[PDB]
Design an enzyme around this catalytic site. Structure first.
Site, short mmCIF file in Angstrom:
data_model
loop_
_atom_site.label_atom_id
_atom_site.label_comp_id
_atom_site.label_asym_id
_atom_site.label_seq_id
_atom_site.Cartn_x
_atom_site.Cartn_y
_atom_site.Cartn_z
N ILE A 171 0.85 -1.20 0.00
CA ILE A 171 0.00 0.00 0.00
C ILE A 171 0.89 1.26 0.00
CG2 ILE A 171 -1.66 1.36 1.40
CD1 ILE A 171 -3.00 -1.44 2.07
N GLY A 172 1.58 1.52 1.12
CA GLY A 172 2.43 2.70 1.29
C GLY A 172 3.42 2.58 2.43
N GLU A 173 4.17 3.67 2.75
CA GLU A 173 5.16 3.62 3.83
C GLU A 173 5.48 5.00 4.45
OE1 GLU A 173 8.19 1.91 1.04
OE2 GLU A 173 9.66 3.06 2.21
N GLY A 174 5.43 5.07 5.79
CA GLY A 174 5.88 6.23 6.55
C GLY A 174 7.37 6.22 6.84
N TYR A 231 9.07 5.41 9.84
CA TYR A 231 9.48 4.21 10.59
C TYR A 231 8.45 3.05 10.47
CZ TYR A 231 6.42 6.12 14.27
OH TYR A 231 5.34 6.60 14.97
N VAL A 262 3.13 -0.39 5.03
CA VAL A 262 1.71 -0.79 5.09
C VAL A 262 1.41 -1.76 3.94
CG1 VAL A 262 -0.68 0.04 5.30
CG2 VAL A 262 1.19 1.48 6.10
N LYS A 279 0.28 -2.93 9.18
CA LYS A 279 1.37 -1.98 9.21
C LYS A 279 2.52 -2.49 10.10
CE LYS A 279 -0.72 1.45 12.44
NZ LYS A 279 -0.68 2.91 12.72
N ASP A 320 -4.03 15.54 14.96
CA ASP A 320 -3.52 15.51 13.59
C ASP A 320 -4.58 15.06 12.61
OD1 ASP A 320 -1.57 16.02 11.62
OD2 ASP A 320 -0.67 14.06 11.88
O1 LIG Z 1 -8.71 -2.08 -4.01
C1 LIG Z 1 -7.58 -2.14 -4.47
N1 LIG Z 1 -6.59 -1.29 -4.20
C2 LIG Z 1 -6.74 -0.17 -3.28
C3 LIG Z 1 -5.39 0.45 -2.90
C4 LIG Z 1 -5.42 1.06 -1.57
C5 LIG Z 1 -5.43 1.56 -0.48
C6 LIG Z 1 -5.46 2.15 0.83
C7 LIG Z 1 -5.85 1.38 1.91
C8 LIG Z 1 -5.87 1.95 3.18
N2 LIG Z 1 -6.31 1.11 4.23
C9 LIG Z 1 -6.08 1.08 5.57
N3 LIG Z 1 -6.79 0.18 6.29
C10 LIG Z 1 -6.55 0.19 7.61
C11 LIG Z 1 -5.65 1.04 8.19
C12 LIG Z 1 -4.94 1.91 7.37
C13 LIG Z 1 -3.96 2.89 7.91
C14 LIG Z 1 -3.34 3.80 7.05
C15 LIG Z 1 -2.47 4.73 7.54
N4 LIG Z 1 -2.20 4.82 8.89
C16 LIG Z 1 -1.26 5.85 9.45
C17 LIG Z 1 -1.31 7.15 8.62
O2 LIG Z 1 -2.64 7.52 8.30
C18 LIG Z 1 0.17 5.35 9.60
C19 LIG Z 1 0.83 5.57 10.80
C20 LIG Z 1 2.14 5.14 10.98
C21 LIG Z 1 2.80 4.51 9.94
CL1 LIG Z 1 4.44 4.01 10.18
C22 LIG Z 1 2.15 4.31 8.74
F1 LIG Z 1 2.82 3.70 7.74
C23 LIG Z 1 0.85 4.73 8.55
C24 LIG Z 1 -2.82 3.95 9.82
O3 LIG Z 1 -2.53 4.05 11.03
C25 LIG Z 1 -3.71 2.99 9.26
N5 LIG Z 1 -5.16 1.94 6.05
C26 LIG Z 1 -5.51 3.29 3.30
C27 LIG Z 1 -5.13 3.99 2.16
N6 LIG Z 1 -5.10 3.45 0.94
O4 LIG Z 1 -7.14 -3.08 -5.32
C28 LIG Z 1 -8.04 -4.16 -5.73
C29 LIG Z 1 -8.91 -3.61 -6.87
C30 LIG Z 1 -8.18 -3.19 -8.14
C31 LIG Z 1 -8.42 -4.09 -9.31
C32 LIG Z 1 -7.90 -5.29 -9.49
C33 LIG Z 1 -6.95 -6.00 -8.56
C34 LIG Z 1 -7.53 -6.30 -7.18
C35 LIG Z 1 -7.12 -5.36 -6.04
#
Ligand SMILES: O=C(NCCC#Cc1cc(Nc2nccc(-c3ccn([C@H](CO)c4ccc(Cl)c(F)c4)c(=O)c3)n2)ccn1)O[C@H]1CC/C=C\CCC1
EC number: 2.7.11.24
Length: 348
Positions: free
Chosen positions: A24-27, A29, A32, A47, A142
């Site tokens: 998904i992504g990365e902060g 430290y 995800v 995460k 935040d």
């Molecule tokens: O559906 C898709 N793709 C979608 C892509 C996407 C996404 C996405 C998910 C998310 N979900 C999600 N859920 C639960 C919790 C969290 C979450 C996110 C961020 N943080 C925080 C920041 O806010 C944080 C804190 C510290 C660190 Cl160190 C850190 F790293 C991050 C949290 O605390 C918790 N984030 C969020 C954003 N974006 O693909 C299909 C369909 C496509 C077609 C065909 C193939 C099939 C596949």
């Protein structure tokens, strides 16, 4: 047998329960991923956090864990599971498992026009979750679009409690241009003038900025640096009134504001010509300069704009105030507390 899953130059040490990972992504430290939970047959978000070399990272990880494990609310992300090594010595990372959310409001705003009905419903859910947070005497500190998670049916959940604090209004006062940690564009004007951000009104300001951003898909106050943020705020709200100045006793902050040329208020209906007029009345109340006069969460829920959703019997509060705070502790004791706090998720 097998080995631990890799992603992008990072071990992802989550098995055997959680498999079929996707990035998904990365902060700073952490990283995800999504992953298939084999026990509850659904994909989850995971995460990886690696905080153990810096006390600030340890402090934030611990805050998040302690808060999210105590909170239970439909509009607040939960923690489903935490995966880590069975011993302190072997523990270099922590994995926090949460309900998988499709997107976040930051991503959604860069790509999608929101209908007034979507804005209304998003705002209702944000305030509903915030009522619960504030009822626990906690400040999120935040709130911003990337910390508002959305699923495919537009249920909204507040995440990232790493900068949260217990409210402390009697120690809110500080000097002018005092450094602050939370995200610039969503900082209340008093942060730059005389506030440490220890009162609930700090979060209302952020929600006001979010509301404004839902209306236009653009941040309302996109400052490029600490004092530019105040330029942007005053640019729309106009010069503070005498009464509002008289509440700022600190002379450096007072005199700065007095030094500025008169600026007229920009009417909300000129910035947001297509918005619902009730939405703009509530925006005005959330983006009030004087934090004492700013609307509180429970008043905001009771505002006419949200009347189709408002139901205080279905807007729950926390069973008790939150308490305990960690600012001195070194990374070594904070590792022990993180180990201790994650112990309930272990086998045994
Ligand atoms: O559906 C898709 N793709 C979608 C892509 C996407 C996404 C996405 C998910 C998310 N979900 C999600 N859920 C639960 C919790 C969290 C979450 C996110 C961020 N943080 C925080 C920041 O806010 C944080 C804190 C510290 C660190 Cl160190 C850190 F790293 C991050 C949290 O605390 C918790 N984030 C969020 C954003 N974006 O693909 C299909 C369909 C496509 C077609 C065909 C193939 C099939 C596949």
């Amino acid at each position: 047998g097998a080995g631990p899953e890799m992603v992008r130059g990072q071990v992802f040490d989550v098995g055997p329960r959680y498999t079929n990972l996707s990035y998904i992504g990365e902060g700073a430290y952490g990283m995800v991923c999504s992953a298939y939970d084999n026990v509850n047959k659904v994909r989850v978000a995971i995460k990886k956090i690696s905080p153990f070399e810096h006390q600030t990272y340890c402090q934030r990880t611990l805050r998040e864990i302690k808060i999210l494990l105590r909170f239970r609310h439909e509009n607040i992300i939960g923690i489903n599971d935490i995966i880590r090594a069975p011993t302190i010595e072997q523990m270099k990372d922590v994995y926090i498992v949460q309900d998988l959310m499709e997107t976040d409001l930051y991503k959604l705003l860069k790509t999608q026009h929101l209908s007034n009905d979507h804005i209304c419903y998003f705002l209702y859910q944000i305030l509903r979750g915030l009522k619960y947070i504030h009822s626990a005497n906690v400040l999120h500190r935040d709130l911003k679009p990337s910390n508002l998670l959305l699923n495919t049916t537009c249920d909204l959940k507040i995440c990232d409690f790493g900068l949260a604090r217990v409210a402390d209004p009697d120690h809110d006062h500080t000097g002018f241009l005092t450094e602050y940690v939370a995200t610039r564009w969503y900082r209340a004007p008093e942060i730059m003038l005389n506030s440490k951000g220890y009162t609930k009104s700090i979060d209302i300001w952020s929600v006001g900025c979010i509301l404004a951003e839902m209306l236009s898909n653009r941040p309302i106050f996109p400052g490029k640096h600490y004092l530019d943020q105040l330029n942007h705020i005053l640019g729309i709200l106009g010069s503070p009134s005498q009464e509002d100045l008289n509440c700022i006793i600190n002379l450096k902050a007072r005199n700065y504001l007095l030094s500025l040329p008169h600026k007229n208020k920009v009417p909300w209906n000129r910035l947001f010509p297509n918005a619902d007029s009730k939405a703009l009345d509530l925006l005005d109340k959330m983006l009030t300069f004087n934090p004492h006069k700013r609307i509180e969460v429970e008043q905001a829920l009771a505002h006419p704009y949200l009347e189709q959703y408002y139901d205080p019997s279905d807007e729950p509060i926390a069973e008790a105030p939150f308490k305990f705070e960690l600012d001195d502790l070194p990374k070594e004791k904070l590792k022990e507390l993180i180990f201790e706090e994650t112990a309930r998720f272990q086998p045994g």
